[PDB]
């Protein structure tokens, strides 16, 4: 059973191997042009609804009307799919937010943001387990005389940093889960000094993506940019991502949506402009499991 193979050589002969043990774990580590501009691993680079082979975007009775599409991205090059081997899952439009010359950014979590959306939300709380992918459609228009740029980031397991410097990992379930409402980024860290009666919530610094890493590198995550000059909307198609095939939607949030001003909003000459950002999100290829009496969370 001796295994002979080519040695790791320079560029101007081989070695032999025998496995002594029954468990593979015991085994030694087995070590494995024209156009430079081309990506080695495209999918890791944020492809388009176009770029993997896949306008009126429609789910159930809900439907987006979109010319914008080169502005879309399929996370990790992977399209949503059923746990293999429903019109509760449709497009829900969340409460519109306002972008101003001084906004630092906004965040949301999935499924959390959708927890009260019609039959979807119901299905979520009546079952132990649930899984779902998403289509995130960020809407934000302005004039040809306005300027600015939004960075729309979809982060897997988006754990955010807390307000305390005396204790760690202590943000309350209530605070961690804002629902549709949102949750927002800040320009500076402000430690919750109230010892006795703790705020127990996140303190997300913008240039650190609220998680201890530099915002400039947030682009290694599935993302899209809204440049007011060229486009008014972004569409992110998100797959179910997890260390499990299915999980508790109530205990665990799979994806995080982060929206930050890469370039600040500016208009004509007004000292203080504003424009709306509307998020319409739809759950995809979704399925639930382990039906029983309804979960009634202490959200407060």
């Amino acid at each position: 059973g001796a295994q002979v193979s080519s040695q790791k050589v320079g560029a101007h002969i081989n070695y032999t191997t025998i496995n002594y043990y029954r468990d593979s774990a015991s085994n030694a580590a087995s070590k494995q042009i024209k156009d430079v501009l081309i990506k080695t691993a495209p999918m890791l680079n944020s492809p388009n609804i176009e770029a993997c082979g896949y306008l009126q975007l429609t789910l159930g009775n809900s439907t987006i009307t979109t010319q914008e599409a080169a502005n879309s991205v399929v996370a990790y090059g992977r399209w949503p799919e059923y746990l293999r081997d429903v019109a509760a899952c449709r497009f829900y439009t969340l409460d519109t937010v306002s972008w101003t010359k001084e906004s630092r950014g906004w965040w949301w979590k999935l499924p959390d943001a959708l927890r009260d959306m019609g039959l979807f939300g119901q299905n979520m709380y009546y079952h132990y387990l649930g899984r779902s992918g998403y289509t995130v459609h960020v809407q934000c228009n302005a004039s040809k005389f306005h300027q600015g740029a939004l960075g729309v980031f979809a982060v897997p397991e988006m754990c955010l940093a807390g307000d305390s410097n005396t204790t760690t990992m202590h943000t309350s379930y209530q605070n961690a889960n804002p629902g549709e409402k949102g949750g927002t980024f800040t320009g500076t860290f402000t430690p919750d000094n109230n010892q006795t009666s703790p705020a127990r919530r996140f303190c997300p610094v913008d240039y650190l993506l609220g998680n201890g890493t530099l915002l400039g590198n947030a682009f290694v995550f599935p993302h899209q940019i809204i440049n007011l000059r060229t486009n008014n909307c972004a569409t992110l198609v998100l797959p179910y991502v997890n260390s499990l095939s299915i999980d508790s939607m109530v205990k665990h949030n799979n994806w995080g949506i982060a929206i930050l001003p890469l370039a600040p909003l500016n208009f004509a000459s007004e000292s203080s402009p504003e424009i709306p950002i509307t998020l319409t999100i739809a759950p995809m290829c979704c399925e639930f499991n382990g039906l029983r009496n309804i979960t009634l969370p202490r959200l407060q």
Binding site: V36, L37, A149, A263, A268
Partner: protein, 59 residues
């Protein structure tokens, strides 16, 4: 590492003509810039980084 022997040269940006805007529009604006490696790229000799540390550590 910064070393004269293996220096790589200079990147610089300029105004070819100039930025021109009409009235009722912002005279100042921002450009963002990005970098990455091309597919002809590679690295060698794995090593520890200085970009993080435990000074307080004791090993």
């Amino acid at each position: 590492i910064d070393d004269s022997f293996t220096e790589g040269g200079y990147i610089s940006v300029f105004y070819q003509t100039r930025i021109v805007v009409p009235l009722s529009t912002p005279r100042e604006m921002d450009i963002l810039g990005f970098v990455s490696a091309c597919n002809d790229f590679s690295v060698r000799l794995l090593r520890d980084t200085t970009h993080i540390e435990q000074k307080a550590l004791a090993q």
